[PDB]
Amino acid sequence: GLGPLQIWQTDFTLEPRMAPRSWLAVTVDTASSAIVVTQHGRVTSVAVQHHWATAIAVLGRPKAIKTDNGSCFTSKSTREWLARWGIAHTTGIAMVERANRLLKDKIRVLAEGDGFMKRIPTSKQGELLAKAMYALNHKERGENKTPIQKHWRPTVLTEGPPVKIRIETGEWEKGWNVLVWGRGYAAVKNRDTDKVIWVPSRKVKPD
Amino acid sequence: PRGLGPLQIWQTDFTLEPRMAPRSWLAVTVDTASSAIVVTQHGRVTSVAVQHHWATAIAVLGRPKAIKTDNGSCFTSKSTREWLARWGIAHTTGAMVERANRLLKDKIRVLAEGDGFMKRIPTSKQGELLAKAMYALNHKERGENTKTPIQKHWRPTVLTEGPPVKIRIETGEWEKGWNVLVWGRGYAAVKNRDTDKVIWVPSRKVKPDI
């Protein structure tokens, strides 16, 4: 939906260039379009949980995931696992298809770009896949945002959260932000005047 | 030895975790500013392994300007040096990653014993368990932090000029021409008001000015 970590779509897909572990578990966040890929020798019920756990480690935990129906998606094990994680499950029978195409194309390009015209040597598969991931998630997909931008909204803040401080009245005054704490003082910057002062920590509360 | 913002300086290390035998080598990288960690399993330490590991870290965290390691032969091979150079990542062989190894190993311990594995974790459960540990490390606040490591990584706070401080010189007096950019429990980054120069000093040696 309109939001990272709401609905993901997961699918398995066959990339023989990655043999013997030619099975690729693909997950994409429907809002940010961030991909996570893991490889597997066969499409088991443990592979899926491994995959999802990976993608969760990268992306965070989602409200819900859409898969097709089974059989390793509708494993007893798999449902029990989802429930353990508190992750809502949608079956059906798309966006992750598009992902499969982008992903297999990026892989063909990297592989051929390094001199391997068929099956990629096993040892180099990991790095290659990781490069695919870096490309699809970090590098612009057209004249409009990267998945990284959409998932994380990256930015560099120049001060901390807003706060109020107590002045020579007893009143709490808004219009201030925390830069650092040290030795029981907060350094604080007025966001109108750019003035910075040290204030006893007790005299500082969030806004 | 530390960055002021993410993707400046990473630290990397291989650690041995017997619970994850037979492939018990974990490559661990931590970003010195965000504290985010990336981990991968390896069956032995190699240039191939470290390159794969770093590629993985880069796909997760973005590309860093520099990486510090120890004088481990796998970081200084021809293969790895050409790799780093291709990616334009500076390398140096100058603790944050040690802390990271401790946190990682603790988490792995807790999750493994939380599921009856007091020993080697079964081979097929290793992947998921490590992924779980990585999730708990980057997507949960490290105690006193209000932000998770991943949040600090993507939306960091980087002070423009920093508030004035006195630092206890060396003789042992408080010198007054300094500003502070990062103030941790262990260490503080301070800037002199007449140079570009930023140095890391122990927090006991820094106090607010007026």
Numbering used by the authors:
A (entry chain B): 54 to 146, 154 to 204, 206 to 268
B (entry chain A): 52 to 145, 154 to 269
What does the paper say about this structure?
In most retrovirus systems, IN first removes a dinucleotide from both termini of the linear blunt-ended viral DNA (∼10 kb), termed 3′ OH processing. Next, the same active sites catalyze the concerted transesterification reactions of the nascent 3′ OH groups into the cell DNA. RSV IN consists of the N-terminal domain (NTD) (residues 1–44), the catalytic core domain (CCD) (residues 50–214), and the C-terminal domain (CTD) (residues 222–286), similar in size to the corresponding domains of HIV IN.
Although many crystal structures are available for single or two-domain fragments of HIV, RSV, simian immunodeficiency virus, and bovine immunodeficiency virus IN, a three-domain retroviral IN complete with all structural domains has not been characterized using x-ray crystallography. Earlier crystallographic and NMR studies showed that the extreme C-terminal region of RSV IN spanning residues 271–286, and the corresponding residues 271–288 of HIV IN, are disordered. Thus, we generated RSV IN(1–270) lacking this flexible C-terminal “tail”. We have obtained crystals of the three-domain RSV IN(1–270) in several different conditions. Although the crystals typically grew as very thin needles not useful for x-ray diffraction experiments, the crystal morphology was improved by seeding and introducing protein mutations. Diffraction quality crystals were obtained in the presence of a solubility-enhancing F199K mutation. We demonstrated here that RSV IN 1–270 possesses the same capacity in vitro for 3′ OH processing and concerted integration as the wild type RSV IN (1–286). A possible explanation would be that the residue F199 interacts with the NTD of RSV IN to mediate IN tetramerization during the concerted integration reaction. As RSV IN residue L8 aligns with E11 of HIV IN, a hydrophobic interaction between L8 and F199 might play a role in RSV IN tetramerization.
